[PDB]
């Protein structure tokens, strides 16, 4: 209304996964902002075959 939402910009809780919506594990690396167990998963599709 102070009294339902807090000062969440910077840290971990602010940003959350794309796919599942979790905080745990993050892939920031390249406008990516997923989690860091899922990724891999699809991905092989998404771009990220491999070459090793």
């Amino acid at each position: 209304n102070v009294w339902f939402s807090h000062p969440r910009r910077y840290g971990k809780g602010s940003r959350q996964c794309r796919v599942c919506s979790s905080h745990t594990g993050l892939i920031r690396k390249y406008g990516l902002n997923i989690c860091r167990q899922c990724f891999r998963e699809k991905a092989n599709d998404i771009g990220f075959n491999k070459f090793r």
Binding site: V19, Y30, G31, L32, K42, A43, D45, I46, G47, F48
Partner: protein, 111 residues
Amino acid sequence: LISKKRKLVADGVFYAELNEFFTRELAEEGYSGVEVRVTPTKTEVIIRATRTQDVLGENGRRINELTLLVQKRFKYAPGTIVLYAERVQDRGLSAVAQAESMKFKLLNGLA
């Protein structure tokens, strides 16, 4: 405006909502993936799929349904988004489909 890295990423990730949204709703249609295109005019998504005669929508509304989602979610002017579904030529050897044809076989009550 984005750094080429910055683009060919979100451009792959595009294959991570049409690959999905179709996964779940089109769990029936034969889900056949997709070509996300660019051409200097459109962004055109060709839905291959093995039942174009419930996807087409009793006239063209079921196809103006999956666009006028694909537009409002991903921002597109109205026009820059035409879904051509297209049958799926060589059905025996999809892998994914003959799996979706178990999931559909089992549900339906089988041994």
